[PDB]
Design a protein around this motif. Sequence first.
Motif, PDB file in Angstrom:
ATOM      1  N   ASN A  81       0.810  -1.230   0.000  1.00 37.16           N
ATOM      2  CA  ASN A  81       0.000   0.000   0.000  1.00 37.16           C
ATOM      3  C   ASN A  81       0.845   1.283   0.000  1.00 37.16           C
ATOM      4  O   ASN A  81       0.346   2.377   0.285  1.00 37.16           O
ATOM      5  CB  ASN A  81      -1.042  -0.020   1.144  1.00 37.16           C
ATOM      6  CG  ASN A  81      -2.073  -1.092   0.887  1.00 37.16           C
ATOM      7  OD1 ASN A  81      -2.528  -1.259  -0.245  1.00 37.16           O
ATOM      8  ND2 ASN A  81      -2.471  -1.831   1.898  1.00 37.16           N
ATOM      9  N   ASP A  89      -8.831  -4.902  -4.405  1.00 31.14           N
ATOM     10  CA  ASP A  89      -9.339  -4.227  -3.202  1.00 31.14           C
ATOM     11  C   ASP A  89     -10.704  -3.581  -3.489  1.00 31.14           C
ATOM     12  O   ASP A  89     -10.828  -2.772  -4.412  1.00 31.14           O
ATOM     13  CB  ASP A  89      -8.346  -3.182  -2.671  1.00 31.14           C
ATOM     14  CG  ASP A  89      -7.139  -3.766  -1.955  1.00 31.14           C
ATOM     15  OD1 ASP A  89      -7.105  -5.004  -1.755  1.00 31.14           O
ATOM     16  OD2 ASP A  89      -6.217  -2.979  -1.595  1.00 31.14           O
ATOM     17  N   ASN A 122      -8.890   1.109  -9.173  1.00 27.08           N
ATOM     18  CA  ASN A 122      -7.736   1.002  -8.272  1.00 27.08           C
ATOM     19  C   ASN A 122      -6.430   1.380  -9.000  1.00 27.08           C
ATOM     20  O   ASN A 122      -5.580   2.057  -8.436  1.00 27.08           O
ATOM     21  CB  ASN A 122      -7.633  -0.423  -7.689  1.00 27.08           C
ATOM     22  CG  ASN A 122      -8.569  -0.630  -6.517  1.00 27.08           C
ATOM     23  OD1 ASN A 122      -8.737   0.256  -5.678  1.00 27.08           O
ATOM     24  ND2 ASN A 122      -9.171  -1.788  -6.402  1.00 27.08           N
TER      25      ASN A 122
END
Length: 278
Positions: A81, A89, A122
């Motif tokens: 991350n 995610d 994402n």
Amino acid sequence: KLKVVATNSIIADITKNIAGDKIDLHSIVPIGQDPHEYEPLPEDVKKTSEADLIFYNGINLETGGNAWFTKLVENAKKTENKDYFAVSDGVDVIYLEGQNEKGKEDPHAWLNLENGIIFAKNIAKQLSAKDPNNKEFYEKNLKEYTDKLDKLDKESKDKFNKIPAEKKLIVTSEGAFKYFSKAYGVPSAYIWEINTEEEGTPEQIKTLVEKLRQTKVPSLFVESSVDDRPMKTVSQDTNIPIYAQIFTDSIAEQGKEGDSYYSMMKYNLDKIAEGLAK
């Protein structure tokens, strides 16, 4: 240019559709190769050590068994991350045998287009965070791309919805299509479950054959990336023909039908709808 590494050709192709020529992109698992069981080569190791941003599938695709991706990022001293991100995610996760626990997540999320859209979102988020100068460009490409996926998703849903319910069943060798089943309302049947040691035994073949003889499914399918002899035996024993080969975890070679995440999904959704509507 921002240095990006993608773990496989599906993720890489989605990244190309968002980033265009703004990045320096490298993909690890090549087109048609196995993204669960893979041995990264020296070029992969060097590219990953140098990467600004690394995208992986998550949900145990590359971290189960040999856990090649875990070893790769740990040896590259990259941080979760910060340097590497799971494109899955936010997906509504399916679990092996319906048991909600860490490590039982079904990895095949991209086989519904709503999850392909989540993947794209994402990717765009992290590209924009690392490269703010190209943020409006990534956002413009994201909106166009997700509109294209959404349009295909709605059209495919309309097709499956018209099929008589008795005929709606997606039969494949491995049970890798549960996310497809969930989104498009076409239940799954298969020879062997995900992460089965022994693939295509006479007992597995017999079990599926006996289930299918009690259905009205008009077509079977087979994955392009598996040994087709178990599904050919099922077809022979049930007298249900194999209508088409379909993609699972890779796009096709450049220039062929299915050579992008969009084309791959279009091919699969159209062929499954065709085969079942017969």
